[PDB]
Amino acid sequence: APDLRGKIALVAGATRGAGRAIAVQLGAAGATVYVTGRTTRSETIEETAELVTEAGGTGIAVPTDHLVPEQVRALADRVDTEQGRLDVLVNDKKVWEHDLDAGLRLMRLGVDTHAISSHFLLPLLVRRPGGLVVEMTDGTAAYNGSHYRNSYFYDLVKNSVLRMGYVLAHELEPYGGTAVTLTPGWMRSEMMLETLGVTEENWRDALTEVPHFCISESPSYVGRAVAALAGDADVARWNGQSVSSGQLAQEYGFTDLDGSRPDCWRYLVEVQEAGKPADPSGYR
Amino acid sequence: APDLRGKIALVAGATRGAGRAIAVQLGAAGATVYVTGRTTRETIEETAELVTEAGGTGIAVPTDHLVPEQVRALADRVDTEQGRLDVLVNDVWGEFDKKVWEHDLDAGLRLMRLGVDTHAISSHFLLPLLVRRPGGLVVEMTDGTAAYNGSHYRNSYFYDLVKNSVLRMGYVLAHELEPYGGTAVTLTPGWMRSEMMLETLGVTEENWRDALTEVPHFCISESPSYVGRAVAALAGDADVARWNGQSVSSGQLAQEYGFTDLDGSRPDCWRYLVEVQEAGKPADPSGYR
């Protein structure tokens, strides 16, 4: 397990989902984790901060509207003020049938938030060599390169975030910084679980409803992937790359909480898209 | 030369640059071209007038492509006047030395909205008429090919994201159009001798090589009409669907279709940049145009 004691991390959008689990596993590795989000006081950013500390780290919730630049500027001044450093930064319809106002808003919320974040927080990170940026997305470059993702606006956002890691990787290298774009697999998120009417303790009950859900992973999986990167002294070998939680589980050797290693994106192509029946053998 | 007589085309953002040159070469191939832009009476009307003299029909529709109501009215007009849309070209566009945190943020966000949102609004309102019948063609204009951009950082954070988003737009639209018999590609010009480029170097088109002393690698440049002839070759290709979803360049299509620039050459900008300029070799167009 990575020893991240003394490290300063910030997870933008950590109220729920991968962001919370990422912040929590960073705290479990011993880091101080700034966690941001709009929903305040549990399904709150404060609850996220409390989970980071409970895990053995220090979680500091900073409520932020990441589309409001002055709020992200204030966020960046705060980490500098309190810490003086930042080691890890974590960020059915045709196009003409889709609702246009929603699609444009989706692209602004999914892309502009990352750009505003990098503009204000990257100066502190490149202040010393060794900083790491992880841009979170849905899918790998290899998968998204040959697959349309759900909708026009969704697809554009997720592939923009893929490019953001390549772009930042070129901008950060002269400072000794690293940027990657990371995706989870099929997450057993709090939202996903309630949608299937199950708890984490009894998640395979849903396999009758969704048989291919047998490849799913807990949110802590991609959280341990980030911790492995932030603890990697030669993490710069990944600079500019698109990576997945399952790919990094094979490289670093961590497991999900249940000890398995789901490999979602190979399963989707070789089994599910291949017309084969749901069968996790050899994929977790 | 392609015979596009009877074809109805629309070029979004056709006041100048590739968009004007594309609209003109479509009219020279016989098309009726709707040309849009904000700049009216170096105007969109001038673009329409140039389409007509070239042997076609240019119809200027001043449009703010960031205002959906205006783009919807534009789409209703083509249906009202023509009832069909065969070719749609998207060329709507809005700090080369700066990091994302050094760049001006408000400008960068405005750059991404003007360069990405305008294309999405355009596809939302105009694609229904285009997919009404098979054989429609969508051309999303960009800077660079997927092969080049995949291994090259492009100018700035915001610029890079915009141009690579439009590349993805061609792939995405290719999936949405296939059941309708429609085709989408993303096309880039080379280094265009645009009106802006020519004035920046203090030259005219008639004497453009005078600039080689100050910019030697400009020897690979092309006139705007080159990429215009690439669009016309696609729109005239009965088997254009073989390109569906692909990223293409003006020089690559010159090799495939056999057209030339106005001066009879075939600049291959993106191979030249990698094999000569980025390789440290001196500027020498031999074998690249």
Residue numbers in the entry:
A (entry chain A): 9 to 49, 58 to 107, 119 to 311
B (entry chain D): 9 to 49, 59 to 111, 117 to 311
Paper text:
As a family of DNA damaging genotoxins, THIQ antibiotics exhibit remarkably potent DNA alkylating activity through the departure of hydroxy group in hemiaminal moiety followed by an attack of N-2 of guanine in GC-rich region. Here we discover a self-defense strategy featuring with reductive inactivation of hemiaminal pharmacophore by short-chain dehydrogenases/reductases (SDRs) NapW and homW, which are integrated with the naphthyridinomycin biosynthetic pathway. When the cofactor NADPH is replaced by NADH, the enzymatic efficiency was dramatically decreased. These results strongly demonstrate that NapW and homW functionally catalyze the reductive inactivation of the highly reactive iminium species, which implied that the two SDR proteins may participate in self-protection from endogenous DNA alkylation. Collectively, these results unambiguously supported our proposal that the SDRs NapW and homW axiomatically endow cells resistance to NDM for self-protection.
The structure of NapW contains a typical Rossmann fold with seven β sheets embraced by α helices, which is the key feature of SDR family proteins for binding cofactors. The binding of cofactor NADP+ enables loop 47–58 and loop 107–119, which are too flexible to observe in apo-NapW structure, adopt stable conformation and are clearly observed.
